[PDB]
C-alpha cells in the first residue's frame, strides 16, 4: 500500500481546502523557512492519531487556521489521508475537528479511535509506536546509545519490556523467560539479519560490514547489545568508538535496520539530513531512492538540495501573509530531467 494524497482543510497554516500530492514513491517536501513544512508534518501526524500535546498546541481547536491570533477561520477543520492498495479501491482515513473533539472517519463512516487504530494497524501503520516516522535528531539519538540503551530500545519495540515486570516476579518461570526471550528475538534477530546489507548500501561499498550481537546469548534482555562495524578502509571496532562521519553512517544503518522490522508502508523522514555532509548525504539519498522502488514509500522533509533532488516528486511549500501565515503547495516532477 501507499499514501496517495493528503487533503487538508483549515488545519494550522493550511487555510481553506487544499490537495497535497499526489505522492510518488519518493517525494520530498521543500520550501523556504516558515512556509509550512513542519505544519504539514503535523498534518500527517494528526491524521495518524498523534496526541494534541505533540502538535504544538494546548487544545484541539487551536489547530484550526487563525486560532493562534484569535481569528479562527472556521468552526471545523480536518486532515484526510487517501490510502491505496493495488487490487482494492482507495481508502480514506480522516480526523475532523468537531466541537473541540476529534471525529474519526474511514471512507466517510464515523468510527471510534479503537477501530481507526486497528484498521491502520492491519495496514502496518502503528499509531502508538509511530513506526512510520523518523523525527529530527533520531540519528543523533541513536548514535548516542550504548549497548545497554540499545537493549532498552529493543525491549520497547519488541515489547519484551512489557513482560519485564512479570519476569522477575517469578524469582519453572521459563514459561515467561522463554517468551520474553522469543518476543525480544522476534524483533532483534530481524534487525540483526538486515543491518549488514543496509550498512553496505548506505556506505556504498561492499567491504563495509556490521554485526549486532547479544552480550548474553541466553537472556539478551539482561545485557547490552554489541554493535561492531568494519568501516570502509578500517578494521572492526565497536560502533561507540567510531568517529564523526563514520559514526553517523553506522547510526543511520542501525536506525533503518530498526525500521526494517514490521516496516510501515510509508516512511516520513523529517530533516534526517540536518546532520549529514556532502561526503555521504547522497548515499543516504541514493539509498532512499533505491528502497523507494519496492520496499517502502518515502516522504522526506528536507533542506539540502543534494538530498531532495534524488526525489521523484517535489512538494514545494510557500507562504502568503494573512491571519497568521497562509501556506500553499506546488507539485513538481523531477523524473522529466536527467542527471
Amino acid at each position: 500500500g501507499f499514501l496517495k494524497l493528503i487533503e487538508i482543510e483549515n488545519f494550522k497554516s493550511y487555510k481553506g481546502r487544499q490537495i497535497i500530492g499526489p505522492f510518488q514513491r519518493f517525494t520530498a517536501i521543500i520550501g523556504p523557512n516558515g512556509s509550512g513544512k513542519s505544519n504539514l508534518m503535523d498534518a500527517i501526524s494528526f491524521v495518524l492519531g498523534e496526541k494534541t500535546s505533540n502538535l504544538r498546541v494546548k487544545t484541539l481547536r487551536d489547530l484550526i487556521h487563525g486560532a493562534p491570533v484569535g481569528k479562527p477561520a472556521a468552526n471545523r477543520a480536518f486532515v484526510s489521508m487517501v490510502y491505496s492498495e493495488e487490487g482494492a479501491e482507495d481508502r480514506t482515513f480522516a480526523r475532523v475537528i468537531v466541537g473541540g473533539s476529534s471525529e474519526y472517519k474511514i471512507n466517510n463512516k464515523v468510527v471510534q479511535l479503537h477501530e481507526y487504530s486497528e484498521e491502520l494497524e492491519k495496514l502496518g501503520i502503528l499509531i502508538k509506536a509511530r513506526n512510520f516516522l523518523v523525527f529530527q535528531g533520531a540519528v543523533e539519538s541513536i548514535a548516542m546509545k550504548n549497548p545497554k540503551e540499545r537493549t532498552a530500545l529493543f525491549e520497547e519495540i519488541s515489547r519484551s519490556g512489557e513482560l519485564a515486570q512479570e519476569y522477575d516476579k517469578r524469582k519453572a518461570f521459563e514459561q515467561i523467560k522463554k517468551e520474553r526471550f522469543d518476543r525480544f528475538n522476534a524483533c532483534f534477530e530481524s534487525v540483526a539479519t538486515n543491518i549488514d546489507e543496509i550498512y553496505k548500501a548506505l556506505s556504498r561499498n561492499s567491504s563495509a560490514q556490521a554485526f549486532l550481537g547479544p552480550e548474553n546469548p541466553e537472556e539478551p534482555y539482561l545485557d547490552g547489545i554489541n554493535y561492531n562495524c568494519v568501516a570502509p578502509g578500517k578494521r572492526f571496532r565497536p560502533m561507540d568508538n567510531l568517529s564523526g562521519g563514520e559514526k553517523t553512517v553506522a547510526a543511520l544503518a542501525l536506525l533503518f535496520a530498526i525500521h526494517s522490522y514490521k516496516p510501515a508502508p510509508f516512511f516520513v523522514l523529517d530533516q534526517i539530513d540536518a546532520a549529514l555532509d556532502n561526503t555521504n548525504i547522497g548515499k543516504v539519498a541514493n539509498y532512499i531512492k533505491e528502497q523507494s522502488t519496492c520496499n517502502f514509500q518515502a516522504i522526506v522533509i528536507s533542506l539540502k538540495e543534494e538530498f531532495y533532488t534524488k526525489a521523484e516528486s517535489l512538494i514545494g511549500v510557500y507562504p502568503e501573509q494573512g491571519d497568521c501565515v497562509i501556506s500553499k503547495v506546488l507539485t513538481f516532477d523531477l523524473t522529466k530531467y536527467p542527471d
Partner: protein, 61 residues
Amino acid sequence: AESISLLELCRNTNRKQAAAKFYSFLVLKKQQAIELTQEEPYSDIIATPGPRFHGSLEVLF
C-alpha cells in the same frame, strides 16, 4: 501582463537545475516578487508579476 512558465524555463536542464528553478519560484513568491498559478497538481507553474518587484520577469530568470 507578463507571464512565465516554469516548465519552459526547465526545458533542457538537469534535475539539480530544474529543482533550483522550482525552488526559486518558492523564494520569489515569499519575497512577493511574483504570483504563482498552478491549475492542477503536476501541471505547469506560471509566474506573473507581484506587488514587490517591477522589473522584467524574463530578465529576472
